[model samples]
Target chain A: GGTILVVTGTGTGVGKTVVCAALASAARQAGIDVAVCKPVQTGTARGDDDLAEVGRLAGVTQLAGLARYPQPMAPAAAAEHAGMALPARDQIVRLIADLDRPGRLTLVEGAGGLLVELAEPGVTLRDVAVDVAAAALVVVTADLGTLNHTKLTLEALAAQQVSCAGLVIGSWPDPPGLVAASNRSALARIAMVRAALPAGAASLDAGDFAAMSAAAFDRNWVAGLV
Target chain B: GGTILVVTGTGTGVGKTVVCAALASAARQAGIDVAVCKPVQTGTARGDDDLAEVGRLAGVTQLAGLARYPQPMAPAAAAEHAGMALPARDQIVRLIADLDRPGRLTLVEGAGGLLVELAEPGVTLRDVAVDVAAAALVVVTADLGTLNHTKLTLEALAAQQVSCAGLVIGSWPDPPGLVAASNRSALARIAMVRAALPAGAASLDAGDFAAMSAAAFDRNWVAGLVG
Candidate 1:
């Protein structure tokens, strides 16, 4: 209750959507009400919306996607190109505050990384998390390049005094290769790995998805957070 | 006549080695005296050194790698693992300054990205570039996630007041896919693209490598900087 967990990525296409789905499924299985909010959904006019994808994978229909743009770019850039107005930062905070009522786990999915501008110039998910006092879960790639990105993003968050819940490898491949294996241990030195969703985790059936989610996340650890 | 350009990447294996070779070949073809430097070469005690690879492709033998570590990690971390003492930041600066002569193009290849520690606890390539007042060339990947990293790196460079020569896509395959094709222009919007070396560039013969480097870079634009 009253805990907003913000999920952001080191970069785009690191499986933030899948991680969010897994978290949502795990929370629901633990008998906790989970609500997901995607502040601004880009690439919907031309492609699939992330919230809809989360709904299909997690089997959770109670989702809110505040704004959307068609272009597959930063939300502010996409919104500007589409000639639409984005909600003010205050309004977005108010909206999230309303959904973050007692007895509900509110998860807000960021557009790209910490610094990717959302609705306005210089207004990023970092500011949102800090303003809401939310615990951030930074999603990182499982590759040779992830360590630098993860460290940089985490340091940026720390500079703002925002608390980080932990780190998650959005997609951990089966039969981990040398680079991935090396990064697994190196990343743990930076932050605790809350969950590592294997590749193709999103394609499983509803029952399988829940089981995979439960198995991936420590039940007691997740329960103690929210 | 002393000028240095430090080439750093969004991360390791993003083609910084090949880009350095291309820059060396291009500068040599244009009749400029160019030298390449790798301040710290890690993982070479077990494998090939990037300097030798660059020498093979660019026909350049005036290469300098001040330090070498056995492990394949950040220079400080690798040095610690090997029980070696890394050169202080001042030593690296002095070495690069000595190599930089009037009308000579010095290419300093960083071990990894801007913030990757080179020797000391907090020393990075960014610090060396700042201390030497050298222009930086940011090498990035040609894929979906490159835009964010490229932007972040450029912003970091700007914050340090280190001039950026431009951005370069280290390895651009012949037949680019959707993500690579899209990033071509998106990257240009962020900064001027000096060159986009073709994949398999390092495997080419010296003559062919020079030719490919010439074809990839804008001859007039490149000349204006180092000439």
Candidate 2:
């Protein structure tokens, strides 16, 4: 049996994909087979693909995706814009369950935020987590308005009985500005500070990204995943 | 008894001060007395004064604030940087209570979001609202992630048994985009949207802002806020 974790964010553009990649890289380095799943992806028209980004950055080939919509919008809006329908609930759940296997750390990423509709009938990552029995790794920003957002995300997770794995600061700017530093301290009080991925990490080369990923998280924690 | 409403936002710089000023402006125009209280203010180093903004934008002379930190950070962080301590929780509650009088709409503007600590002992605006027996007027943005943020803020308020007065979109963009338009509609399903103030409302002069504010909110709702 393996651990399946849902990587959601407090809000959009909180670096959900990069954190997914970083974690995947960290797991792969620990000799753990990693698979990244993006149930619903949008902004395909503008070339937005988290699985591809993860494969490029972390070399995780088992990247799975169910739906993709053009236009840089929320999954629901993007799907509506393209006159396409969101995937069915069972399709998302079954795919995630199928991905779960022995010694494999499967990372499921959500679109937009936690409550975003990734499937039909307003099913969210929270609901998917409930169905798949997966804990959530919330991606958050280390800036103003983060504490409230972080707390709200955690509350929503708690509302559905979704165990929060921890919080990852999506972007930790260099030089550590006042707002970022303060939020970093404040965020820890809200939940465990899993990792503060260095800013501009997404643009890093594969070798560099892999190196950063390995150091971004605790080696023991990465090893403990599988 | 006066209505003590805490004007909080989903996040920092979500146009909270502007909403407070506009709400005060709207209520004042409706023949309602309005007093705005900002217990803890940060970013004083860059001359960020929310009370002054309210006073200037709404012609609200009864603007009050307790501690002002000269840093653009959260209250706790700003206070520490300024080598100062956050004010006591009672101090903030008492200040609002003093400003509260019969038939007045006293707005307690928070430092950041509803959860940010405004005083010592890790007290937040939600805690202050609990002490003052006030309702929360959540200021939000109609941009992306608003629904989730608003829901979260509302949930936090409910957790403390704090009454949610309504939600005010601080900056409703002109010719709203797809997401913004959708969010405005989605927000209405969750809570009564008090108003969606036009973008750059804070830049309006006294007469224009007052007129805009009055038009932004329903006359009956503004009048009904007072006895």
Candidate 3:
């Protein structure tokens, strides 16, 4: 019933879950009850499946719901093969209720990247995020093509009228290169989102995220009036 | 053997193949003698995979010609990774004989979306679709945030003209979001090309499709308008 934050990445394996985990952990220390849900998940890992671990790492016990579809391909085609399609509105409503049950803040991470199909009949992560009306925390990595991908993702979100919460700059291939780090700044400049806040050491742990100041998670950094 | 639909999407998972499958299935079921082909497929499975499946489902045995690229990347990138270039026109033409058998309704599906490059120096889907003088379907999803996508896709297809076979909505979600349905009506009403229909509800099965009333699958919608 309140401002839910949706975490998205420029591409797959861009550390979007880690950023969401950090945000959740950060919010929990602030004494704000939190819940997390990944409406659609592919490529689930052990212990850290979908967005559940993101919640657990933050010490939030509330596991709302998660829809796992086989076919591992993009959602649309996968859904086509599966026959029945579309994100179940009823399931999404269940997750929303948990967020509103204790009036807890919720964070939902999307599958694949934006425009990625989550189901047939044309349901996608972008469509789900919009319907939920949540401010987005777009996570970007310090990669070679980060600039273009970052800019387009942010712009596309803006074009869809989604509020951007902030940008988290993650470092990959440790001993991060300066050029890639600088490109993150360039992305923030081109997009209507907040400046990039580098997640220290490329790993978002419960300890650091739980201690992050509210000033660090400030919503106005990338707030677009339009 | 006439206008082929050059279908493409704004993004990778944006329902390009879905729409292409639906259109081909619809065309074949409509009692039109259908022959399908895909010049190249770079990522994941071959475009022929989808086309072949559609052929099976729709009962069109003629296998789709797939110009394969091993790397699962963009056509240009995939070609580069293979230490070779994209397929040449002759290469595609040689893969399958012309359906000169006559009465063959040629429906070609393009990989990715329109304007996507399959090779290095040349050859985009648009070029291939144009070469066959096929009407463009420009398959798109009826999900939220398609205004920019459909608009840009239409702009690209319009530039190529040659009997654009209207727009077809790939997946139907939540009764077509306001913007998506509105775009459908808006584009059709504006005379951008012909008509637009939701694929899922259109009962796009082959039997129902082949049995479609002439108004539903009118060849004149794209016939003689091109070439």
Candidate 4:
């Protein structure tokens, strides 16, 4: 009886893990139990563990994942580079489908960006979201070229009829420049900006991260997300 | 009687100018009369003039343009900051249409990315391309996020029936790194990688630039543009 959201972004390194953790922390603070599922994990050899980060930041025990490759490349190429096949679409969907429960918010973190191929035959996070009937929480940056990517991501979501939960500026600069400030106002025109997490929020300790997450998003929106 | 292509990028500074100049040069060398149209230009105060660059690099004298905003922001923001209006949609289309000719290739370079506002009433370069019946030649980087941006741009182009001409790696690095080398292969799976210009193609003199441009693209493809 809760919501499921696929956490996506305009591009890679836009803080998808931190946003997943932040949103999880925010949702949990509202007394709604939370779960995060990362169907594809790449760059494990380089210590890229999104689930571990989420567990550390949000303390989510119900985290689930399907694929893990060693290289820090896109899933398809990463799998191929290592001579391992990517997870099937049906396999990824079942893991998240089982995690959905009453009084719990489930979040699926995508690899790279929304359109990145997560499995064989060119499947993507957009496909997974549609299969799970989940809305999208797009993470973005407050920089030039953000608006175009934001619009393009939103348009892709709309094309699939995946309801966009809202946008979250993954990193909001301390001293906003003219372009960053202008893009923030401009981003809101296209969709609701859920939150603009402070720069370097990922480096904060657990307690500070939790407090920041709660403060970053609106109380009402967090409550209503479930 | 000619092909009209809107040269757009995944984002700004992804080498739209170099791709435009290189392609224009290649086409002209193939005996195709080339005209480059930069509909809306920004960063004029910083001496950023794409038309001048095209003329200098590609020897394309048949360049046309509509508006210029001195501030280096997106067209809408730049126009607003300078207390000026963005050109109307009709003005940009008319500028390109007037440049169209038989046996010529007219290249329309966008201000930023495809969805950026270029005119009043929230029009964009995508709409401009659609209005002029032009295909899109997306300029992309071989950097970290190129795959997603390229896919997004391609999907947007397909959504509007705006055919994608091809893709060009605007600035292929000096000694390609692992990421750059891998992306070049990955991007080829999505679209034809028209040309990957050398890192410092811009700093090359006219003669060197011409030779580099001539060698960048396939001779047959350049010659086939004019029907």
Candidate 5:
């Protein structure tokens, strides 16, 4: 079985969905049978809204699972408010295990940021990363806002012993903003982490299915990411 | 001597510095001799800069510490890059004890956020908060982009078992927009935190000092927050 590649963020609105879609597209172009899964979806539309879009981008119509909640709120709150039963711990574990079955390259998208609340307390996206023992990528904005958020998120993940695949700065208006560029340098100098992903894939339509058709993956781009 | 109050945020820029300044101002207004200390400074000028303006606002002169690094990054990295000496763990214990000796309310402003980096690897702001034996006031921004930041900050603090003074929201724009309003309610419900400090007071100027100067501390307003 291919290792699970977990996509998460420093915080919300830093563009995890876009990067996830891009990864799926790139993976598909690499001739891999990809199985994408967002175990829980909160704060977004369900039933072929984003999940189907991911499948389309990956060019792999077979998604393992996409248990989406109705409301555009957190999973637990949305579940409780809507009177929907939240998935149990074992259920999620089994679900992930099933998705990561033999020979499938799995990409798991986290609900919120790293420590997002699930139906149960003490169960965060970080816990999910640990459970699956996946290689994690932290998607961050490439500006001053990312300074604290990215550092804290990476530190927290490192504290949990999660193997970081490296950081991807999405939606950066410019490729080499001084602060952003310096951060990449300093981050590498200190943590030995690779600043793997660059900014401004403006043409890469994350929500579009056709983005994967001509996608490309350079091993050198993600060589030391894990 | 009052207990040391350690102010921090769940995430960065949520306004731990702002709340710390507000607390300092309020203490000064109440005729309490309060000194502010930030064990490290990263990414910007010291919180004491705001605290100094807050001192001007509150008409109080207080002591500010110089435990800072040059890189303007995480304390751990800043210390490493700047060649600044890392304070011994016991140094904090001794300093907090010494600061408390004057029997004044000593307010400690932590850098970055709770769980923010420290001078040494694996030592975060939570470790320092525990070392100082201070109650942490988790600051959440009442801004458009605070839901995940606030939630994770709270979770990290909770996981560390760091004593909480309560929660305070910073940088709330007036008549908060959708995201801010939603975050405020969510934090209240999820963290069971009290004491809303209002928007913009995190950078409170002298005129704003009048609010805390009132003889009677509004019980409902203050909830359980005290120096």
Candidate 6:
């Protein structure tokens, strides 16, 4: 069977979708069969879908979404808002497991932050990662107030004894400013940095996007994982 | 001895200083001897001092800060940047305890978030709160991204089994928007709302600031604490 990788962000709009795309791209370029799963897709009614964007940018057609909600909120909140039923934890775990097949890496992208409620009664991404025994990759921001959030995310993972796949700067600016520069270095010191995708990467053409995405991550690291 | 109330924010620039001023102003107006303490004042060299602002806005003269640093980073980072010795955890505890005399309330304003190291080797405000047996008051922003941060902070506190006094909205807008409006009600559901200090509250005159701050909080709540 293949391994499952869970991707979670520090907060909403922290480039989690782009990072997921980059990871998918890197794996695909390496001749690795990759499938991306979004447990719950929010803002679907408003055209804010992650699976479509990931497929376009990462060039991966194998995608799965357990549920979809119209509201642009946390998965559970959004589901509740739209009067939709959220997928049960067992169902979500089974879907992720089903996606994981021999020589096929499955990437599960969380809705918002690691602790955000994905279903009823407050089921979070952390719970999903632990249940599936998948290594979590926390996507963080590259700015001044990131240290605390990054540290908290890492600590939360550690507290649960969940294996981490290291951190990724969801979007690093083209011209690095003082805050970004300091965070880039400080972030590495705080936790293992797997990649730092350049800003405006999502808008790149498919060929360039795949090439840049591959270059963003550590080759030796990716090789070991696959 | 006075009770030491620790005030920490979810993040920096989340109106922590303004909340500190309001807390002090409220206590002082009730004829309670309230002193504000800044354990480690970073960015003082750049004039980003919270104590001075609290003194000005709250009309609180009894302010104490253990150490000052030039850089605008966390205390430990700032101390390292300045090549200065970080105040020992014991030193910080003693400073707050000393401020905690009978009928006087010492509000200890933390440097940044609850987890940010105040000194060397990863000592945080959570540690200081435990050492002094003080109740921590977490001041959070009234916005969309607040729930997660507030939840995380409260969870961190709960993990330590610290006694949390309550939550406060540091800078509540006059005419609240969707996010802020929802957050105000959601925050209280998550934790007790001690008060919600208005935005631009710092600009209020001394007399107006004191009265407004007092009114923002429940008088019964203030009485129970003062007694």
lDDT of 3 by residue, B82-135 (tens): 776787765655443464235555666666656555544445666566666665
Q: What is the lDDT, from 0 to 100, of the residue A75 in candidate 2? A: 79
- Quote the lDDT for A100 in model 4: 91
Among incorrect, acceptable, medium and high, the docking class of model 4 is medium
Clashes of each: 2, 0, 13, 0, 4, 4
Q: Which of the numbered candidates is closest to the native, going by highest TM-score?
A: 4
Please give the distance, in angstroms, between residue B104's alpha carbon in candidate 4 and its true position after superposition: 1.6
| lDDT (Cα) of model 2 | 0.91
Docking class of 1: acceptable
Query: Which residue pairs come into collision in candidate 4?
Result: none
Give the Cα-based TM-score of candidate 6 against the true structure. Answer: 0.94
Measured against the true two-chain complex, the DockQ scores of the candidates, in the order shown, are 0.34, 0.67, 0.03, 0.78, 0.32, 0.49
Better of 2 and 6 by DockQ: 2
Order the numbered candidates by lDDT, best leading.
Answer: 4, 2, 6, 1, 5, 3
lDDT of 6 at A22: 95
lDDT of 5 by residue, A156-184 (tens): 78778998876665554544755666666
lDDT of 4 by residue, A91-157 (tens): 9888898999988999999898899999778999999999999999999999888999999999999
Q: Name the regions of candidate 3 deviating beyond 4 angstroms.
A: A45-48, A69-73, A76-87, A101-103, A172-176, A192-205, A208-226, B1-227
Candidate 5 docking band? acceptable
What is the TM-score, restricted to chain A, for candidate 2? Answer: 0.98
The candidates, ranked best first by DockQ, are 4, 2, 6, 1, 5, 3
Summarize candidate 6's per-residue lDDT along A71-183 as a digit string, tens digits: 77666556766777788888888888888898887899988777877765577788888988888898999976788888777777877877889899999997987568777
- Compared with the true structure, what per-residue lDDT tens digits does model 2 show for residues A163-219? 999999999998898788888988898898899999999999999999999999999
Reference-based TM-score of each model: 0.82, 0.96, 0.47, 0.98, 0.77, 0.94
List residue ranges in candidate 6 displaced over 4 A.
none
- Deviation of model 6 at A101, angstroms: 1.9
Whole-model lDDT values for every prediction: 0.83, 0.91, 0.56, 0.92, 0.62, 0.84
Candidate 6 on B87-186: residue-level lDDT in tens? 8898898888878888998999998888888866678889899888888899998876787788778878887888888998988998987557767877
lDDT of 5 by residue, B61-115 (tens): 6655556555655565566666667666666556666777444667777666665
Runs off by more than 4 Å, candidate 2: none
On TM-score, the stronger of 3 and 6 is 6
